[PDB]
Structures are given as structure tokens and as C-alpha cells.
Amino acid sequence: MKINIRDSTMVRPATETPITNLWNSNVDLVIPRFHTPSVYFYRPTGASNFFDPQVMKEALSKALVPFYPMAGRLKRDDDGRIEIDCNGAGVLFVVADTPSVIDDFGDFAPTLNLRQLIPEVDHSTGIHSFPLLVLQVTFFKCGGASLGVGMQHHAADGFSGLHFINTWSDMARGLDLTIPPFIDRTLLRARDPPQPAFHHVEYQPAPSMKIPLDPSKSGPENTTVSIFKLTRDQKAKSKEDGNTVSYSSYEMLAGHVWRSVGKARGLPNDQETKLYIATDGRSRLRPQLPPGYFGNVIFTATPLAVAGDLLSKPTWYAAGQIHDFLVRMDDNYLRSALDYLEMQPDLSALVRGAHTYKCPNLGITSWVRLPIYDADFGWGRPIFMGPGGIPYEGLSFVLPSPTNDGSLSVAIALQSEHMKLFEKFLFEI
């Protein structure tokens, strides 16, 4: 598609913010190097001032006073550890036009051309040379608009990122700050001395294919991205084969996706397959994190199975493996995990910038509980919000319904031929 940039502004906090160096916990360091992409789409109201850039920039500068680290930069301290240089250098805000219309995105499958709706960042020069947050409003021919978001997660995770975007929109509507950000990640400081109590499977290497796969076709350029609606349901039946154990809706769904992906990939009976589940630690850490905690708190649950078992046993078996790993992740385990991380020489080497989400493994994250449609800047809630292009194969997202309409969507990247079979997705037998 064709993007025409009309304006590009570095937006700074509306008033003076603290000049300071913000420490990063171990969880703020096991972080992808690139900016994480997300996109929102809005229908026109028909009003002339729809997404007025002036209103947007003014409210952005305002939100950047309590969320001031967002306007900072990356630096390393004396020990070489990355920290946030809170210098209020600011946030990139781009305005664009395109002859395309929103309806061209059809089902809003998060294809990679979505990246054109988010500003590009050059990571080639230093870590201190790019804003932590880049933003783009693009006006479509149809009168509609997208908001493109690129955020470097050393600043914070997607949950705190949402807190910021929603606050920004509240302010565009002339409203007040509701939950003030809490800015201090020493709450996740590791114990001294570090004392891990577990062997943490979730930091071990992913299983490889016992029999290596044809690099292409089956690489970057054989990867399709699709989205699928599940229309409720359309947890039951976990009663299959007389199983009495009750599993949650999330457990059953994640197990189903994991299993369906295994089936679609034709995994041999003896092939191990690992599932990586984004798990929010805010509700599990037991001194209990302040509301508005600004930072990363996303841990990962990694249940494993042999495909022979995963694919021949009922879906509740998959849900069971998942549940077993989700249940072990209480404060004691997460504290253990922080201590484990503390002893590793190089935290950046533990980042799954995968590579490892490749057949036979899978990542899944659910945004079902997240306030992803609350960003009303004064012209209505978005008709869609999703990841801004799934980078590579083996990543999946569960998205709540914009209308609810208790429907769910599964957005996922797989190899071309695997994707067709993934239509295994649509039978609970």
C-alpha cells in the first residue's frame, strides 16, 4: 500500500518532568530489541475534526507528564546495564494519508503490511538514538483512520502500554488522569543472595525437530498470517471420555489452538512440542503490585508434550498440561524465577526473538482481559485493535470481540500449507 507522510513531530511533555535514570528489573531486560507493533482502526463519524492532529498532539504532551519515562531514551549504566534515561526528549508523532480504504484489510488479519501504519525505527545507530515510542495516525480514503503504535518494551510491557494509550485518549476527551502510573521497578529486584528454588523450564531451549525441516519452502516467505472468528462456542466439552476435571475457558482454548497447530503441522508421534504462554504476573506476585505499576511483569508458562499424546488424547489433556504449568506460577515460583535470572551472565541472550517459534513450537498470548478498545480519543471506540503484523511463524494472539457479541478471534502465523489444515481449528467434535 502507499503511505504519504504529511507531518512528523517530536512531541515533548507539556511541562517539565523529572530528569532521572530509571532502573530496569530483570523482567524489563528479557525484552525484544525492536519496537513492538500494535494498530487501532476507526470509522469516521463524518465530522471534519475527526482525529484532529492538534488535539492529538496536545493530549499526547499532557499524557507524557505523568508517563514521563515514555518520553525518555535508552542508556547503559556503569555496569553496562540498560536503564531508561528520562530526559523528556519525547515521542515521535507522524500524520499520514493513503488512497487505500480500511475495508481493504478485510478480516483485519494482522499481515505484515500493517507495519506501514507504524513509523519505522533505525536501530542501526545507538540504543540512545531512537524514541521509546513512535506513533502514526493515517487517514484513509474512506474517511476512516488508523493509530499505529511502536513501543520499545524496555519502557514497559503491553499492559502498561495500554494504560498509557488509554490515558492519552481520556485526555483528548478533556478527562482527568484516573490511575496515576507507579514508577519504580525495584519492586521486582532479585533477592540478595539470589536463591532459585526451582528448575525453570520456561528458560530452557525449545525442542528442535528430531528430523530437520526443508528451510524453504517453509521459511519467512512461506509464512501466512490469518485470523479466525470463534462465535461462542461455535470449556465444553471438557467432559469428553468421562473426564471430570474442570478447566477454564482459557485453558481449553489454548489447548485447542496448541493441538490444532500440532495437527496442522503433521507432527510425528515422537516429536516434542512446547507451548509458550504469556502470563501476567501482576495478579500473582504477592506483595501485590501497585495499580498503574509501570514496567514489565509478563512471565511465560511453558508446558510441553510429545505430539503422540497431544494429538491423540482429548483436548482436555492439552488443557491439563497447561493448567499444571499455570498453577505452579505463584509468588514463590516467580520470585524464584527472578533469582534465576539474576544469576545469568547475559539477560539479552534469553530473549526468544525466535527462531524458536518455528515448528514444532508455539507461542500464544491472550488480550481478552485487556482494555484494548478503551482508546476513544473523542470520535468513538476503535472497530479493531490487534498486533501490528505478526513478525514470524508460530506466534498466535487471542483477541476479544470489538462488539461483544461474546466472540473471540485467533490471529496466527503459520507456514502456507500448514495454515490451510489449521482449519482443524473449527471442530470441537
UniProtKB/Swiss-Prot annotation:
Class of this enzyme: transferase
Q: Does the keyword ATP-binding apply?
A: no
Q: EC annotation?
A: 2.3.1.133
Q: Which domain of life is it from?
A: Eukaryota
Q: What's the catalysed reaction?
A: shikimate + 4-coumaroyl-CoA = trans-4-coumaroylshikimate + CoA
Record's GO cellular component terms: cytoplasm; membrane
Can you tell me which residues bind 4-coumaroyl-CoA? 248-251, 280-286, 366-369
Q: Does the keyword Acyltransferase apply?
A: yes
Q: Which GO terms describe its biological process?
A: cell wall organization; lignin biosynthetic process; positive regulation of flavonoid biosynthetic process
Gene Ontology MF terms: quinate O-hydroxycinnamoyltransferase activity; shikimate O-hydroxycinnamoyltransferase activity
InterPro entries, per the entry: CAT-like_dom_sf, Plant_Fungal_Acyltransferase
Going by the UniProt record, its keywords in alphabetical order are: Acyltransferase, Cell wall biogenesis/degradation, Transferase
Question: What residues sit in the active site?
Answer: 153 (proton acceptor), 376 (proton acceptor)
Record Pfam families: Transferase (PF02458)
Quote the function comment for this protein: Acyltransferase involved in the biosynthesis of lignin. Accepts caffeoyl-CoA and p-coumaroyl-CoA as substrates and transfers the acyl group on both shikimate and quinate acceptors.
Family classification = Belongs to the plant acyltransferase family.
What name appears for this protein in its UniProt entry?
A: Shikimate O-hydroxycinnamoyltransferase
